[PDB]
Design a protein around this motif. Sequence first.
Motif, PDB file in Angstrom:
ATOM      1  N   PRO A   3       0.832  -1.209   0.000  1.00 54.80           N
ATOM      2  CA  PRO A   3       0.000   0.000   0.000  1.00 54.80           C
ATOM      3  C   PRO A   3       0.867   1.260   0.000  1.00 54.80           C
ATOM      4  CG  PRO A   3      -0.788  -1.565   1.636  1.00 54.80           C
ATOM      5  CD  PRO A   3       0.509  -2.113   1.119  1.00 54.80           C
ATOM      6  N   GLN A   4       0.344   2.351  -0.553  1.00 54.79           N
ATOM      7  CA  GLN A   4       1.051   3.634  -0.590  1.00 54.79           C
ATOM      8  C   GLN A   4       1.289   4.232   0.801  1.00 54.79           C
ATOM      9  OE1 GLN A   4       2.341   5.228  -3.234  1.00 54.79           O
ATOM     10  NE2 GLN A   4       2.897   7.174  -2.262  1.00 54.79           N
ATOM     11  N   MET A   5       2.563   4.399   1.139  1.00 59.45           N
ATOM     12  CA  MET A   5       2.995   4.952   2.415  1.00 59.45           C
ATOM     13  C   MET A   5       2.795   6.465   2.405  1.00 59.45           C
ATOM     14  SD  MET A   5       6.441   3.308   3.944  1.00 59.45           S
ATOM     15  CE  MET A   5       7.006   3.420   5.637  1.00 59.45           C
ATOM     16  N   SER A   6       2.585   7.045   3.583  1.00 55.94           N
ATOM     17  CA  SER A   6       2.577   8.500   3.735  1.00 55.94           C
ATOM     18  C   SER A   6       3.317   8.915   5.010  1.00 55.94           C
ATOM     19  CB  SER A   6       1.144   9.037   3.741  1.00 55.94           C
ATOM     20  OG  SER A   6       0.464   8.663   4.927  1.00 55.94           O
ATOM     21  N   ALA A   7       4.014  10.048   4.958  1.00 55.86           N
ATOM     22  CA  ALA A   7       4.704  10.553   6.142  1.00 55.86           C
ATOM     23  C   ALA A   7       3.711  10.834   7.269  1.00 55.86           C
ATOM     24  CB  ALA A   7       5.515  11.805   5.811  1.00 55.86           C
ATOM     25  N   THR A   8       2.535  11.334   6.906  1.00 54.56           N
ATOM     26  CA  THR A   8       1.476  11.591   7.874  1.00 54.56           C
ATOM     27  C   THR A   8       1.125  10.324   8.654  1.00 54.56           C
ATOM     28  OG1 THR A   8       0.565  13.335   6.478  1.00 54.56           O
ATOM     29  CG2 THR A   8      -0.868  12.402   8.200  1.00 54.56           C
ATOM     30  N   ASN A   9       0.938   9.230   7.927  1.00 54.36           N
ATOM     31  CA  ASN A   9       0.584   7.961   8.546  1.00 54.36           C
ATOM     32  C   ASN A   9       1.745   7.377   9.378  1.00 54.36           C
ATOM     33  OD1 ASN A   9      -1.359   5.833   8.976  1.00 54.36           O
ATOM     34  ND2 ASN A   9      -0.161   4.579   7.556  1.00 54.36           N
ATOM     35  N   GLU A  10       2.973   7.479   8.868  1.00 49.28           N
ATOM     36  CA  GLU A  10       4.116   6.984   9.638  1.00 49.28           C
ATOM     37  C   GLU A  10       4.266   7.704  10.983  1.00 49.28           C
ATOM     38  OE1 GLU A  10       5.908   4.134   8.767  1.00 49.28           O
ATOM     39  OE2 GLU A  10       4.101   4.153   7.521  1.00 49.28           O
ATOM     40  N   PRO A  73      -7.400  28.294   4.612  1.00 50.22           N
ATOM     41  CA  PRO A  73      -7.541  27.029   5.338  1.00 50.22           C
ATOM     42  C   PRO A  73      -6.992  27.105   6.759  1.00 50.22           C
ATOM     43  CG  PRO A  73      -6.601  26.669   3.158  1.00 50.22           C
ATOM     44  CD  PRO A  73      -6.577  28.151   3.398  1.00 50.22           C
ATOM     45  N   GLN A  74      -7.655  26.418   7.682  1.00 44.40           N
ATOM     46  CA  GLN A  74      -7.153  26.291   9.041  1.00 44.40           C
ATOM     47  C   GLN A  74      -6.113  25.178   9.189  1.00 44.40           C
ATOM     48  OE1 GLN A  74      -8.466  29.506  10.517  1.00 44.40           O
ATOM     49  NE2 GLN A  74      -8.007  28.009  12.117  1.00 44.40           N
ATOM     50  N   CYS A  75      -6.187  24.165   8.331  1.00 45.27           N
ATOM     51  CA  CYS A  75      -5.216  23.069   8.366  1.00 45.27           C
ATOM     52  C   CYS A  75      -4.143  23.325   7.324  1.00 45.27           C
ATOM     53  CB  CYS A  75      -5.900  21.717   8.128  1.00 45.27           C
ATOM     54  SG  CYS A  75      -6.976  21.233   9.495  1.00 45.27           S
ATOM     55  N   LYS A  76      -2.885  23.335   7.764  1.00 39.81           N
ATOM     56  CA  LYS A  76      -1.790  23.762   6.886  1.00 39.81           C
ATOM     57  C   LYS A  76      -1.043  22.600   6.232  1.00 39.81           C
ATOM     58  CE  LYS A  76      -2.601  28.000   8.087  1.00 39.81           C
ATOM     59  NZ  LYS A  76      -3.371  28.866   7.148  1.00 39.81           N
ATOM     60  N   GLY A  77      -1.448  21.384   6.565  1.00 38.93           N
ATOM     61  CA  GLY A  77      -0.793  20.208   6.025  1.00 38.93           C
ATOM     62  C   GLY A  77      -1.359  19.764   4.691  1.00 38.93           C
ATOM     63  N   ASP A  78      -0.623  18.893   4.007  1.00 41.31           N
ATOM     64  CA  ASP A  78      -1.081  18.325   2.747  1.00 41.31           C
ATOM     65  C   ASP A  78      -2.072  17.194   2.999  1.00 41.31           C
ATOM     66  OD1 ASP A  78       0.595  20.013   1.343  1.00 41.31           O
ATOM     67  OD2 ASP A  78       2.183  18.504   1.109  1.00 41.31           O
ATOM     68  N   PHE A  79      -3.122  17.132   2.188  1.00 44.22           N
ATOM     69  CA  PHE A  79      -4.074  16.026   2.244  1.00 44.22           C
ATOM     70  C   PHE A  79      -3.347  14.692   2.236  1.00 44.22           C
ATOM     71  CE2 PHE A  79      -7.209  13.281  -0.149  1.00 44.22           C
ATOM     72  CZ  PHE A  79      -8.116  13.153   0.893  1.00 44.22           C
ATOM     73  N   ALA A  80      -3.746  13.813   3.154  1.00 45.47           N
ATOM     74  CA  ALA A  80      -3.094  12.527   3.338  1.00 45.47           C
ATOM     75  C   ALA A  80      -4.072  11.376   3.121  1.00 45.47           C
ATOM     76  CB  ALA A  80      -2.454  12.462   4.728  1.00 45.47           C
ATOM     77  N   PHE A 134     -22.578  13.394   1.456  1.00 47.40           N
ATOM     78  CA  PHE A 134     -21.599  14.398   1.870  1.00 47.40           C
ATOM     79  C   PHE A 134     -20.235  13.744   1.934  1.00 47.40           C
ATOM     80  CE2 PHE A 134     -25.656  15.496   3.533  1.00 47.40           C
ATOM     81  CZ  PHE A 134     -25.743  16.862   3.615  1.00 47.40           C
ATOM     82  N   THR A 135     -19.217  14.434   1.436  1.00 50.37           N
ATOM     83  CA  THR A 135     -17.834  13.983   1.546  1.00 50.37           C
ATOM     84  C   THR A 135     -17.031  15.063   2.259  1.00 50.37           C
ATOM     85  OG1 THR A 135     -18.036  12.721  -0.511  1.00 50.37           O
ATOM     86  CG2 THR A 135     -15.801  13.271   0.256  1.00 50.37           C
ATOM     87  N   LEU A 136     -16.346  14.686   3.336  1.00 50.25           N
ATOM     88  CA  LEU A 136     -15.536  15.606   4.133  1.00 50.25           C
ATOM     89  C   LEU A 136     -14.073  15.231   3.987  1.00 50.25           C
ATOM     90  CD1 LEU A 136     -17.496  15.280   7.539  1.00 50.25           C
ATOM     91  CD2 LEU A 136     -18.034  16.777   5.628  1.00 50.25           C
ATOM     92  N   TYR A 137     -13.236  16.190   3.605  1.00 49.55           N
ATOM     93  CA  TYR A 137     -11.808  15.951   3.425  1.00 49.55           C
ATOM     94  C   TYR A 137     -11.030  16.402   4.645  1.00 49.55           C
ATOM     95  CZ  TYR A 137     -13.388  15.440  -1.365  1.00 49.55           C
ATOM     96  OH  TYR A 137     -14.112  15.118  -2.494  1.00 49.55           O
ATOM     97  N   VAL A 138     -10.342  15.462   5.293  1.00 50.18           N
ATOM     98  CA  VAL A 138      -9.572  15.755   6.488  1.00 50.18           C
ATOM     99  C   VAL A 138      -8.142  16.038   6.046  1.00 50.18           C
ATOM    100  CG1 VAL A 138      -8.897  14.966   8.761  1.00 50.18           C
ATOM    101  CG2 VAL A 138     -11.006  14.100   7.712  1.00 50.18           C
ATOM    102  N   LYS A 139      -7.524  17.049   6.644  1.00 44.02           N
ATOM    103  CA  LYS A 139      -6.111  17.354   6.378  1.00 44.02           C
ATOM    104  C   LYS A 139      -5.381  17.467   7.706  1.00 44.02           C
ATOM    105  CE  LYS A 139      -5.837  21.153   4.016  1.00 44.02           C
ATOM    106  NZ  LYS A 139      -6.246  22.593   3.857  1.00 44.02           N
ATOM    107  N   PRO A 140      -4.130  16.978   7.766  1.00 40.84           N
ATOM    108  CA  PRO A 140      -3.330  17.263   8.960  1.00 40.84           C
ATOM    109  C   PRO A 140      -3.209  18.777   9.133  1.00 40.84           C
ATOM    110  CG  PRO A 140      -2.039  16.029   7.342  1.00 40.84           C
ATOM    111  CD  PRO A 140      -3.381  16.271   6.719  1.00 40.84           C
TER     112      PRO A 140
END
Length: 220
Positions: A3-10, A73-80, A134-140
Motif C-alpha cells: 500500500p502507498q505509504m505516507s509521512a502523515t501515517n508513519e 484554510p485552518q489546516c496547513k498540512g497536505d491532504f493525506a 456528503f464527503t468531508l476531506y480531512v487534512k493534517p
Amino acid sequence: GPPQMSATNEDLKTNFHSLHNQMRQMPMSHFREALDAPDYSGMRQSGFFAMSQGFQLESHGGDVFMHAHRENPQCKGDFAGDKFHISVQREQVPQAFQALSGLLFSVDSPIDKWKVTDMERVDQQSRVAVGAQFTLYVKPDQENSQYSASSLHNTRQFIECLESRLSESGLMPGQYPESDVHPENWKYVSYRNELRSGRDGGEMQSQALREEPFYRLMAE
C-alpha cells in the motif's frame, strides 16, 4: 507492491500511544454554528463562485457535486487521504444539509473542504446518491503534514456532533458505501483512506481500513 505509504501515517504510527492518550484527556470541543449559511437549493446556485462564512462555494455543469472550501484554510498540512462520508436517506438530503450547515460552515469546524451531491443531477442509484451524499476531506493541521492531538480530538468531536445533529434533527440513515468502514456507534458517518483503499473496493479492504491509525484514533 505494498500500500502507498505516507509521512502523515508513519508519524501516527510512531506516536500512536501518545496521541490517543492525550486525546482522552481533552474536554469536549465547542463548535459555534454558523447562522446565515446557504440552504441546499441555494448552494446549487453558487455556479462559478459564491461565498458564505469564509467558504468559497462552487456548483457548475461539470460534475454532480456542490463544493465548499475555506479561502483561508485552518489546516496547513497536505491532504493525506483521510475522508469521511455522511449517508442519509436519499430523499432527505436537503433536510440533512439544513441540519448540518451550522457545523459545516462553522468558524470552529476542523474541515476545510467538503462537497455534497447534487441530487438533481446524480444517478439516483449511485453510491453517492443512496448514501455518502456528503464527503468531508480531512487534512493534517501542521505545516509538516502531521496531525496534532488537538486537531485529531477536534475532528473526532466534530464527527460526533454531526451524528448528534443528524439524529436530533430527525434524519434517517442512508445506505453506507461498501467502500468504507464505520463503528457500531456511527449511524451516518463512514471512513476510508484514498491512498490505501479504493472507492470501488468492498469487504476485501475492510480490515485494512479498520487498521488505519487515523481511523483507530477516530473510532477506538
